[PDB]
Structures are given as structure tokens and as C-alpha cells.
Ligand binder design. Structure first.
Ligand code: MG
Ligand code: MG
Ligand code: MG
Ligand code: MG
Ligand code: MG
Ligand code: MG
Ligand code: MG
Ligand code: MG
Ligand code: MG
Ligand code: MG
Lengths: 369, 369
């Protein structure tokens, strides 16, 4: 059976993938250790992270300048990259250039991990949440403003099963299994969805949801995106670059339904530094927001304040998308992998390359060329 | 004759110089616009910043990913680079890839400018201070935690003439004309020198100064360095990497005299990300701290928790030094410029280059070769 990409993830200037055979690979900026190869050099093409061979990794997730992965059979979570503020979770601030297990999470059944700039969170199979890293604006949800170098349980969610979490620069969001939406952390751009510009040190429930329950949530750097059980898309927070997608640059302090997509059912979402991607159930990918480096993928370098469909060869359907700070990655139905946007750190994975403003196939990871 | 280098300054991954004939040149990482050439590309050799030709610039100063310059005759301050949190001072958060005048500072007589990660300060000829940028931990000294997109006067210094200021990641320091030392902002590693690990939202006087008045102050990322009226060197704050220079890895919460340099009179100081430089009155340069990329300049890649002398061809004396995040620049008595450390963004200015662990001459800017 031909080797394929199982999971992709984009960080600020790097890219990580999990391949069949439980193989982790990475490419892009390596200076802070985020690629995991033991050295500090950029890799312009996918490079196997051999130290994780045989660890049966089942998922990978990038933060801005660090990476996390976990194994079910090993009951282990691993982290590597820039170590400041405790974002790696090991009880110190050391950078790591090679993956190390987060001892505090050993033997815990992991459901999902989210990574922001300087903090991370893990959701357990029982719907509990642990968080770690920078906490200067309450983004850990622990009720104070002191950084945590190790994971701590978010006690505020006692009795509340969490389905998934999301993390931006310095804020955090979550949805419950029953459909409630929460926000906490740095809130100055309205990005918590609470109708104001004030931080929260513990999770606070978003009450203005258009009467709808939310099935998923994702964070860009200072904006937030959610999807309801009817497949409607909502955005809130920072609007400067059109990343909210409402056809203007208006601020939103509560979730605002994106009307242009109302006839579609959104199945996946991703928030970048200053851009946004949404995938429909029919496999159409839409992008919007900042496009200086071509990261929206629509064949130009003009910013886009309304969703525009990203096009692929033969109109192949998209199945996964992940936004970096200046680039975007996607996987299609044909098991092809594409990248676009900024390429100066090698993050596009296509060897030495100029920036790209529409999707470019990553030959190393694809069936086609 | 090769133009005289008047001022050098290092940022996180970039480098800037002012040459005789009032020309500015920059090199290194260009992604955030910090080089000011209108494009976003790294430059591995010194490149003239044409936009400032004829603007009579007398000083340049780098922040992490931005740059500031000012003209005495034009009575103008210019800034460019990453614009988030208002670090450029224009009343918006836009990045600039070419310099623009800070309109709020027009006509003001500037004595000195300091740039941190995301905040800046300017001292006036009358000894007043104005600050702008990120303020989440009180680093602007304005008594609150709201970011400022334009310069604002530090009212706490009314009646107190300031001589010079300094800024780190998220903290700030100052010395007065009368020799008092102050600290404010993020204080979690003891870097304010106030004997604790808590923040200050307004300037607070450092009372433990070894019984000495202070003439100079500089900040690294999370450490602070001062020099007394007798030329003694003091360091405080973070020493995870030995950047305080006391021969161990212990943090200090108040200024601590660096005894190994007690037989020298220190005349210049610079703090980097995880390393430190000090220059004696007889032109000897000492470095210490993190040396993973060779940024201490001592010809190896061993970390140094004590000051070690950086050596130059023919023992030529050093007159200026500036630390970046992973590199260091210096200018010698012979008007040669040298660089060392990390070179991947082109910050050493020597054309395409591997990292260097001892000083390498920048031929483009130097009398010798
Ligand atoms: Mg190594
Ligand atoms: Mg606590
Ligand atoms: Mg509307
Ligand atoms: Mg209206
Ligand atoms: Mg506005
Ligand atoms: Mg290049
Ligand atoms: Mg200067
Ligand atoms: Mg960076
Ligand atoms: Mg001599
Ligand atoms: Mg390179």
C-alpha cells in the first residue's frame, strides 16, 4: 500500500506531517529546534524525524516555533522547539532540538492537542483539559497570571466535557460536547467573543452564538473562528487584514456569521497569523485575509476580505488544510499535498523556491508531480 | 576612502549601520520590513537604505524586528519593520517596509532612543521620556496595561532629568542625570533589580546599588546591566545561560557587581538575547553567556558564564559593540567592522556564510580586508 500523508500541520515558519507507517517528517525553519532533527538548520524539503520512528505517533500539531506529537500505544506526548515560558511542558525553559516525552502526560488518554504561540493545551478522552506555558494574560485558564512550566488541570471545566480546544498568540477557546463555546486569555481585539475587550483568567462562556450550538473552533493569532451544528461559519476578533471575511474590515467582539458561505456546510477550519481557511463538506477550500506572500492561494498578492475559492488541478477535492503565519498547506482526495505562500525558510517543502501565490504540489509527499 | 562607520546596531536577526556622509545601511533578515528597502528579502551584505539618503540621520537603533533612526537637523524620528502593538509609533499597527516619520515626535529634540522587542522609548534633550508600543506588563511606565500606538510622556519622571533609557523583551530601565537607577515592566526573572519577581507599571527606583551612582544602563532580553560612576559593572535578572557573568547560572533580583572585571573601567555595555558584551576604557571587549552559535566571539562553541576577552587582528582596540539575538557586531579603532555568531539570515554582512565563532571583518564597510 502506497505511503500517504495522514496529518499535516503548519507552524509560523515550519511544516510537519505524519505519514503512513507512523513516520513523522518536518521542513521549513529549524533555528529554534522546531523541526526536531537535532540541528538548527532550515530544511527546504520534507525530512524524516528518525528519532520518532517506531514510536507509533498518531498525531502532530505545530505551535508558532515548537511542535507536539503523541502516541496512543506509547501513551506518550512529545514536544520540541523553542522552550521559553514553558511551552514544551517539561518543568524548565530549555529549548529542545530533539523530541522529548512530556512526563506529566504519560499514561493519559489524549483526545486532542492545541498549540498557540507560547502555550499549549491537551484534551483527554474524558473531556478534561490540561494547559501549560505562558500565562501573562490568563491564557492557561487557571485563574492567575503566572507562567506554568508543567501541565496543570483547568479546574473550571470540572463537570463539563470538552470536545476540542484552540489556541492563538495569547488566547484560548473551546467547545464542549454539548455545544457551548468558551474563550479566555488576552482579549484586547474582541477575540474572546464575549462582547468586550477585556482579558479573562478562566474560561468564560460565549452567550451570543446566534442561538446555535458550536461543533468546532479554531484560533488565528488574534482572531477566532467557529462552526455551528448547521455548518454555519462564525468569526470574531481582529479584522485588520480582512481575516474575519465579512467583506469589510469591521471589528467583531462577538461571533459574527459569515453570510457569504451560508449556502455551504463547513467541515474544517484553520486560522493563520493574519489569514483564514475554511473547507466545505463538498471539498471546496476557501481562503481570505492577508495575502502579501500569496498565502491565500488565489493567484495574486492582494489582501482578500471575502472568502475566495482556492483552486487545484482538475478541481480535486480538498480534505485537510492548515495555516501557518505566512504559508498554507493542504491535502487532497487524491492524496496529493500542496503548499503556497512564503517559502524563504523552506516551509513549502518543494526544495529551494520563490514564494508562491497559488497551490504548488509537494512531490515528496504526493502521488502526482 | 571607505566611509567612516559612526554607529552600529543589532536586532534579533538584522544589523544596521550609519556611515559618514549620513548614509544608512542594513542587512540580515528582511521578512518583517526591518531592513527598510521596500521589499521583504534577506540581504547577506550591507545594503544602502536609499529612502534615507539626504535625511541627515545621526543615529540608528534596532529593536528585535524593527528599526528606528533620527535626524537632529531635520528634527525627525523614523521607524520601520514589524508594526504590531504599535512599536513603530504611527497610531496604527501596520508593518512598514520603508521608513516613515513618527509624526508625534516631529520637532522634538531627541537625546536617545531605546528599542525593545515590542516597545520603544525616547529621551529628550530636556530629560523627559516618551514611550510607545506593547504595555501588557507595564513596560511603557504609564501606570496601566494598555498598549499605546503613539508616543506618550512618562509623567512619573516630572522633575527628574533622565540621562538614558534601555529596553528588553518586555521590561525597561533608566538612569537619571543624578545617578539614580530605575526599572519597570515585566519582572518575573528579577530583571527590574527591585529585589523581587513582580512587575511594575510605573518606574521604580532601584535602591540596592552597591552604594554607587549609575552612569549607564542596558537591557538584554530578560537581563539588565549597569555601570557605576567608578566604572564597576553590575548585572541582574536571568542567568539561565550565564548571561549575568558571575561564574554560575544563578538569577539575581538586585544589581550584583561583576567582580572579575573590577580592575577595569567599563565604558560601553550591550545585552543580547542570552549573551552580554562589555567594553573597557582601554578598548578591550569582553563577552559572556550563550555561545551555541558562536555569538560570544571567543573562537569556540562553549557557553561562557564568566567574561572572556574577544580578540581581534593585531589586538586592535574596540570602540563600539552591539548584541543581536544570535549574533554580535563591533567597530574598531581602525574603522573596521566585525561580526560573529549566527549567519543564516545574512546578519553577519559577509555575503553568504556559515555561522562564525570569532570576529570576521565586514569587507564592505572596512578599511582593512
Ligand atoms: Mg544540535
Ligand atoms: Mg497557579
Ligand atoms: Mg453582517
Ligand atoms: Mg452596519
Ligand atoms: Mg480599529
Ligand atoms: Mg534565501
Ligand atoms: Mg545608539
Ligand atoms: Mg521570529
Ligand atoms: Mg595597539
Ligand atoms: Mg539557509
Amino acid at each position: 500500500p502506497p505511503r500517504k500523508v495522514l496529518i499535516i500541520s503548519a507552524g509560523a515558519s515550519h511544516s510537519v506531517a505524519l505519514l503512513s507507517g507512523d513516520i513523522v517528517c518536518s521542513w521549513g525553519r529549524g533555528e529554534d529546534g522546531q523541526l526536531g532533527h537535532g540541528d538548527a538548520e532550515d530544511r527546504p524539503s520534507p525530512t524524516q524525524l528518525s528519532a520518532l520512528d517506531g514510536h507509533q505517533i498518531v498525531s502532530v500539531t505545530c505551535g508558532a516555533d515548537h511542535t507536539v506529537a503523541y502516541s496512543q500505544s506509547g501513551m506518550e506526548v512529545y514536544s520540541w522547539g523553542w522552550g521559553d515560558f514553558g511551552r514544551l511542558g517539561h518543568g524548565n525553559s530549555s529549548d529542545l532540538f530533539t523530541p522529548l516525552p512530556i512526563k506529566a502526560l504519560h499514561g493519559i488518554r489524549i483526545k486532542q492537542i492545541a498549540c498557540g504561540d507560547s502555550h499549549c493545551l491537551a484534551v483527554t478522552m474524558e473531556g478534561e483539559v490540561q494547559s501549560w506555558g505562558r500565562n501573562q494574560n490568563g491564557q492557561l485558564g487557571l485563574g492567575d497570571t503566572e507562567d506554568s512550566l508543567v501541565p496543570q488541570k483547568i479546574q473550571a471545566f470540572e463537570g463539563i466535557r470538552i470536545k476540542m480546544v484552540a489556541a492563538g498568540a495569547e488566547h484560548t477557546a473551546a467547545v464542549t460536547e454539548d455545544g457551548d463555546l468558551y474563550g479566555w486569555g488576552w482579549g484586547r481585539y474582541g477575540n474572546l467573543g464575549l462582547g468586550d475587550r477585556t482579558d479573562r483568567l478562566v474560561p468564560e462562556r460565549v452567550t451570543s452564538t446566534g442561538g446555535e450550538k458550536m461543533s468546532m473552533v479554531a484560533c488565528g493569532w488574534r482572531h477566532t473562528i467557529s462552526v455551528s451544528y448547521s455548518g454555519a461559519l462564525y468569526t470574531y476578533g481582529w479584522s485588520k487584514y480582512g481575516q474575519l471575511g465579512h467583506g469589510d474590515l469591521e471589528d467583531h467582539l462577538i461571533p459574527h456569521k459569515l453570510e457569504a458561505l451560508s449556502n455551504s456546510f463547513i467541515s474544517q477550519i484553520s486560522g493563520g497569523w493574519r489569514h483564514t481557511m475554511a473547507l466545505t463538506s463538498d471539498g471546496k477550500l476557501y481562503g481570505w485575509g492577508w495575502n502579501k506572500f500569496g498565502q491565500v492561494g488565489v493567484g495574486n498578492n492582494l489582501d482578500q476580505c471575502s472568502p475566495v475559492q482556492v483552486r487545484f488541478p482538475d478541481d480535486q477535492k480538498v480534505v485537510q488544510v492548515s495555516c501557518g503565519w505566512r504559508h498554507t498547506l493542504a491535502v487532497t482526495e487524491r492524496n496529493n499535498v500542496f503548499a503556497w505562500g512564503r517559502g524563504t525558510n523552506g516551509q513549502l517543502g518543494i526544495g529551494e523556491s520563490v514564494d508562491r501565490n497559488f497551490p504548488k504540489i509537494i512531490e515528496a509527499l504526493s502521488v502526482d508531480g
